[PDB]
Ligand binder design. Structure first.
Ligand SMILES: *Cc1c(COP(=O)(O)O)cnc(C)c1O
Ligand SMILES: *Cc1c(COP(=O)(O)O)cnc(C)c1O
Lengths: 415, 415
């Protein structure tokens, strides 16, 4: 890392936008892979909605309706879902989180497409929300759950892709970026083999949408999901994008108010996409604030965010490599980590590491990070995990490193 | 209505707590049956969460965890779910809205309990979200959907309850209060016959929780759902309560992160209730603000809210009865309406009524109100609907009445 790069991450042009960080200047929040901190404008956008256009033909209702549509368009443009050049706003579906979006896909796409003997292929890197819905629908449909495995560099090889995704595959669902390893998978290449085999491509983008360019048209996926709260938006909002023809073909998930066109005692006619997939009163204020988060990120420029986060990831990994008592659970190259770096202090339980780090005002995660099959594959029962965002800086990372030296002094070999 | 009662509703001790009402003094918001307006403290409680304890072992995470638990307890106490005297906080499950809670119940309780030939009994008054999930699970399980019908006073009689809920019944799901008629159904009496017949009792309390005392122990229901946004809370938060033994018996609905205890490549062990039913990152800030709404309502005293809303409902119905060109779709007695009064201007489409009312700064709903089978039963294709909350006053209702006289001048018989 050059002097110029180190100077760039020593500077912090962004943290002042986050009230909780300004109010807590001592805290090094290194757990953005669990959830983002909130820009002031996103917090206020939610309150403004409630103060000025709160409603579910009168003006406040017209106003709330237009706010939802404008946020859908912003979200679509953010992920490259554009025609014309018009945003594909009607291919944007709201959920509570990525987890609900993946349950929706597994139920709806699974019922639509899976026959007994079909394969559903996922990776060993998947978060639990891109695992258990597939366990469940596979049992219900007679399909088989297949796993893509990793090589010694924590990657999925082209050879593994061709070996595991064969003619029996019907759905393939893979994380764009692992929330533990930080590995960025070659989703476009996986999609190519998936489609050759007559299968649909599902992408868990919860860890990519905050960090790297997501373009659904370039990725060639059929469905893609992420969570607003991991990209500076509010909690309570997840996004599902899908190809228009496929969403039309897929059956509804939740049923009830607002997702119908008409109802009788015995049956119902469904509304068009995306209302077909949105049952009952939606979180209009959260949707509105998700649009505000998108506008906020666009204003900072995602290319500048990515450049800064790349430098922070490189610095984090570099500094962890100077501690010989630290085992990095993942690649030892910082450029191979998008956002997340998992690690252990050798001989010390992550609960104890995190406790000492918290006493030093450093926030990390300890445990299996909702990727237990991955940790089992890696012969770990738990790890620490530090993660970086553009509102972090070099000093946050140095604080972590100083904390880990304190851990080693308290629990290390000398004791 | 006595002079004292009229004076009570002419006074408005509550509207100043609602920023959108203070900022829009001309507007008569008579659509609280669709969603509440937000007290200032509830809007600010959500922002405060994000500003001060935003996280998903470090302090902000401990703090967010304790906030969720404290809101669960407040909610449990609000609906009478108390031991000891301890709130049954672990029987409180969060969803996005009543609609998702009812889909959860229909899927989970339906898979658990329904055999082919069983009856599911609902009422003709149900909102679509307490209809279509039952259509769906009945088809999947071989059960039959049965409807409780009304008499000429818009009530369900004891004779109808005994006639339709027989030994084949396995699940009965009924609205506590109709969102169209304002009829309060005798849920406790329905529950008694339901249980005699070996069936489970489900209650849609979305229109009762904002207005009348809800005590799950006195109602004798097995499951009960409502929406925070209809009782001065934020959007995005629904509540499901269930008997502890039954929630334990019921299978999970959504699966994935946070609702497990452990996961392998092929299977999973579920977490205890209520985490078993909460998949992925929850809307902690919305949960927190829902607790704030409960505290706000408790501070006003629900008994005083109910007394005031009873007087407003009586006045609304009384004044509508003075307009001979208005047909009330429901009881002509104001005391038979909890919150909602549906009506039509004879010979005028509700879209036109609502449009003129909006030009007069009156907000009502027009259409089928997500209860189309009810309107079909009543030989209506659409109605108007005005609804009252404690932050309304006599002047709001007089504004509606003046607006309806304008409608009659523009579209009535003379034209
Ligand atoms: C955290 C995460 C999820 C789950 O997101 P929720 O918002 O909690 O539903 C899914 N996949 C990945 C890769 C994640 O990092
Ligand atoms: C509005 C309402 C519902 C639906 O509530 P959501 O919050 O939109 O899911 C269900 N039942 C009744 C009686 C309602 O009034």
């Amino acid at each position: 890392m050059t002097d110029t790069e180190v100077a760039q991450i020593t500077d912090n042009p962004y943290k002042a936008d986050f009230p909780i960080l300004a109010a807590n200047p001592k805290v090094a929040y290194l757990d953005s892979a669990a959830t983002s901190q909130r820009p002031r404008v996103v917090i206020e956008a939610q309150s403004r909605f409630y103060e000025t256009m709160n409603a579910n033909l009168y003006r406040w209702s017209v106003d709330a309706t237009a706010a939802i549509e404008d946020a859908r368009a912003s979200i679509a443009k953010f992920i490259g879902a554009v025609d014309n050049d018009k945003p594909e706003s009607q291919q944007i579906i709201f959920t509570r989180n990525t987890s609900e979006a993946l349950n929706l896909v597994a139920s709806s796409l699974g019922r639509y497409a899976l026959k007994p003997g079909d394969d559903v292929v996922i990776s060993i890197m998947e978060h639990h929300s891109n695992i258990i819905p597939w366990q469940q629908i596979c049992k219900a449909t007679g399909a088989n759950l297949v796993y893509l495995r990793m090589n010694s560099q924590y990657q999925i090889t082209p050879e593994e892709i061709a070996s595991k995704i064969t003619e029996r595959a019907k759905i393939v669902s893979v994380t764009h970026v692992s929330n533990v390893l930080g590995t960025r998978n070659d989703i476009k290449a996986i999609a190519k083999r998936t489609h050759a085999m007559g299968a649909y491509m599902v992408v868990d983008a919860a860890q990519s949408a905050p960090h790297i360019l997501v373009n659904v048209h370039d990725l060639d996926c059929d469905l893609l999901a992420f969570s607003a709260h991991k990209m500076c938006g509010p909690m309570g909002i997840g996004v599902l994008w899908g190809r228009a023809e496929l969403l039309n073909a897929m059956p509804p998930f939740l049923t009830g108010g607002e997702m119908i066109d008409s109802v009788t005692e015995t049956g119902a006619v469904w509304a068009p996409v995306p209302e077909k997939f949105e049952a009952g009163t939606q979180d209009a204020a959260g949707i509105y604030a998700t649009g505000a988060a998108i506008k906020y990120l666009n204003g900072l420029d995602m290319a500048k965010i990515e450049k800064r986060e790349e430098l922070l990831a490189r610095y984090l990994v570099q500094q962890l490599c100077t501690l010989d008592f630290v085992d990095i659970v993942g690649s030892k190259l910082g450029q191979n980590h998008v956002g997340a770096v998992a690690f252990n202090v050798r001989g010390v339980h992550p609960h104890d590491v995190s406790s000492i780090l918290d006493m030093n005002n450093v926030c990390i995660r300890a445990g299996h990070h909702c990727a237990e099959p991955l940790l089992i594959e890696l012969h770990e029962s738990s790890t620490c995990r530090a993660s970086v965002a553009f509102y972090n800086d070099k000093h946050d990372i140095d604080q972590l490193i100083e904390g880990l030296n304190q851990v080693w002094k308290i629990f290390g070999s000398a004791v």
